Structure formats: structure tokens, C-alpha cells
């Protein structure tokens, strides 16, 4: 059957929202649309910067965008010109002054989006899908996750009949709401069409609940 989104089901339990601002019903829609435009623009621009998470806040008549990346130098620029250009672009898009902040990820193999992007890049570069899946799973398990599942769907290898292949190591307790499950999806565009990649990573059980998380 169909499965609920692992992040959406925990959005109020052990997971925090990616947007943090208040707006009355008159500007909620405009704020949300500009936020979505910002996310799309950043996703396109920092494609090679190894960016996974974007957090948008609107503290007081302004904006703050925190970008979590494994390539802080490439995001920042040679002398910091790139973050200034990003601030200009984001201010132009959002209509309010915006501040960019950088959060450096020191363990890329425990981040679901980065693994999915790596696997999709391998598939587009025509590495055998089973080899890519097992390499990613082994790398994450060496990095220290307590479980990882990787799934690929589509015309795997160019076959005319599409199918789905998955591989899992460790523990992935999807039905435990307090489990820390990072989830990500990505598309690989090949000559024969689209291949979908899904990654689940389990990093232990969070105790104390949202009070512990400090919502």
C-alpha cells in the first residue's frame, strides 16, 4: 500500500518545520508563494554546492535564509562576493532585506538528500544501479547510521519494462513516531526517461519529545 510521508507525519512530533514565521490570512499566501520561489531559485543555483536544507524565517519586516551545505567554501565564494550576490538576489525576490546564513554539514553520509543526489548523479552517469545502491548503503552504515533503506524505480539499465529495486541495512522503524528518520526523494534524468530515488536514514530514537526538541 501507500505510505505516509515520514517527515510530514512527524512535523509536530520530533521534527521542526522548514519555515518559521507568522502572517495573518491577508499576507499568508503572498509570503508562502515568495518562499516557494526562493526555494526553487536556491535549488537551481546551488545544484553543485551540496545543499540539502533551506530554512526560511521572517523575524521582523526582514528575512533570514539558513542554507545547510557540505560545500561552505563554494557557497560562500572566493572572497565572500557570492553570499553578497545571493543576498541581493534574495532581497530582489522577497521584497524585504534578507540575510543568508551558512550551516556546515560535517557528516554528509547521514543526510538523506545528499545520498539521494549522489545516487541520482551516478545513475545519470550510467553506473550500475545495484552497485550504486550497495555502495551508498555501505558508506552510510560506515558513517554511523543505525539503518538505511534505498529504493530506485523506473527503467533500470534501459529495460523496456520498468521495475523497483530496494536494499536495506540495519533498522528503519517507520511506524515509531519518535524515531529520527530522514527521508529524501530525487530524480535521475536518463536517455530513457526518469528514474526515481528514495532514501530513508534512521539515526536513533528521540526521547523527551517536542519539549526536548525545543519547538
Amino acid at each position: 500500500g501507500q505510505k505516509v510521508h515520514p517527515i510530514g507525519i512527524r512535523l509536530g512530533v520530533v521534527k521542526r518545520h522548514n519555515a518559521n514565521w507568522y502572517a495573518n490570512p491577508k499576507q499568508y499566501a503572498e509570503y508562502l508563494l515568495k518562499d516557494l520561489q526562493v526555494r526553487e531559485f536556491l535549488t537551481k543555483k546551488l545544484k553543485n554546492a551540496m545543499v540539502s536544507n533551506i530554512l526560511i524565517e521572517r523575524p521582523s519586516g526582514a528575512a533570514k535564509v539558513t542554507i545547510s551545505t557540505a560545500r561552505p567554501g563554494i557557497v560562500i565564494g572566493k572572497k565572500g562576493e557570492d553570499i553578497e550576490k545571493l543576498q541581493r538576489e534574495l532581497t530582489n525576490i522577497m521584497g524585504v532585506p534578507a540575510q543568508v546564513s551558512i550551516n556546515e554539514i560535517d557528516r554528509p553520509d547521514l543526510d538523506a538528500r545528499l545520498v539521494a543526489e549522489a545516487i541520482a548523479s551516478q545513475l545519470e552517469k550510467r553506473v550500475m544501479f545495484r552497485r550504486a545502491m550497495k555502495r551508498a548503503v555501505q558508506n552510510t552504515m560506515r558513517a554511523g547510521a543505525k539503518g538505511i533503506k534505498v529504493e530506485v524505480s523506473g527503467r533500470l539499465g534501459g529495460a523496456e519494462i520498468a521495475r523497483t529495486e530496494w536494499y536495506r541495512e540495519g533498522r528503519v522503524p517507520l511506524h515509531t513516531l519518535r524515531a529520527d528518520i530522514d527521508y529524501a526523494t530525487m530524480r535521475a534524468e536518463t536517455t530513457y526517461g526518469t528514474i526515481g530515488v528514495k532514501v530513508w536514514i534512521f539515526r536513533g530514537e528521540i526521547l523527551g519529545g517536542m519539549k526536548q526538541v525545543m519547538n
Binding site: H5, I7, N18, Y22, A29, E30, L32, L33, L36, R39
Partner: protein, 100 residues
């Protein structure tokens, strides 16, 4: 939606915005009781002579991302498909799965 339909919607919003002030002025003149009957009749004639796209009733709410004309949800400005996707990703502040 098609690019033609999206551009049609944009042009209609532009016309409504361009003619917003004069339409309100004519409607106020029509509602005026101190104004002459001839004045109110002329105001009605001018209102009927305005371009059709100046009327806000011809605007249709469309998804801000895809242009879908069904299932709009005024509060978010997105149709149901993109709303479901964004909410379950966690990019919509405050919205969570509801149970009671």
C-alpha cells in the same frame, strides 16, 4: 494549465487593476441620491460601456505554481496537489496532520 490560459488570467488582472478606480467612481455616482437622475443614468451607461475584462467577476483563482483552476484554497494560494506536496515536505509553517 496552458501558457495561453495563464497569460489570459494575467491580462485580466492587469485590466481590472487599470480600471479599478473609474469603476468605483461610477458605482458611487450611481449610488448617489443627491445626484440627478440623468447623472446616475449616464454613470450607468459609462459603467456598461467599460471593457468587459475590467469586471472582477471574470477573474478565476488559479494555483500559484501550476495554474490549476480547481481546488484553490484561498489561504495558501495553491491548488490541492501542490498544497499536499508542500505541507508534507514541511515548507508551510504551522500546518500539521489533524487528528481529534
Amino acid at each position: 494549465a496552458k501558457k495561453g490560459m495563464i497569460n489570459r488570467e494575467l491580462k485580466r488582472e492587469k485590466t481590472v487593476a487599470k480600471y479599478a478606480a473609474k469603476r468605483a467612481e461610477l458605482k458611487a455616482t450611481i449610488a448617489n441620491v443627491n445626484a440627478s437622475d440623468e447623472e446616475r443614468f449616464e454613470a450607468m451607461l459609462k459603467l456598461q460601456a467599460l471593457p468587459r475584462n475590467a469586471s472582477p467577476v471574470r477573474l478565476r483563482n488559479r494555483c500559484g505554481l501550476t495554474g490549476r483552476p480547481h481546488g484553490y484554497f484561498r489561504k495558501f494560494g495553491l491548488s490541492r496537489n501542490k498544497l499536499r506536496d508542500t505541507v508534507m515536505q514541511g515548507d508551510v509553517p504551522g500546518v500539521v496532520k489533524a487528528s481529534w
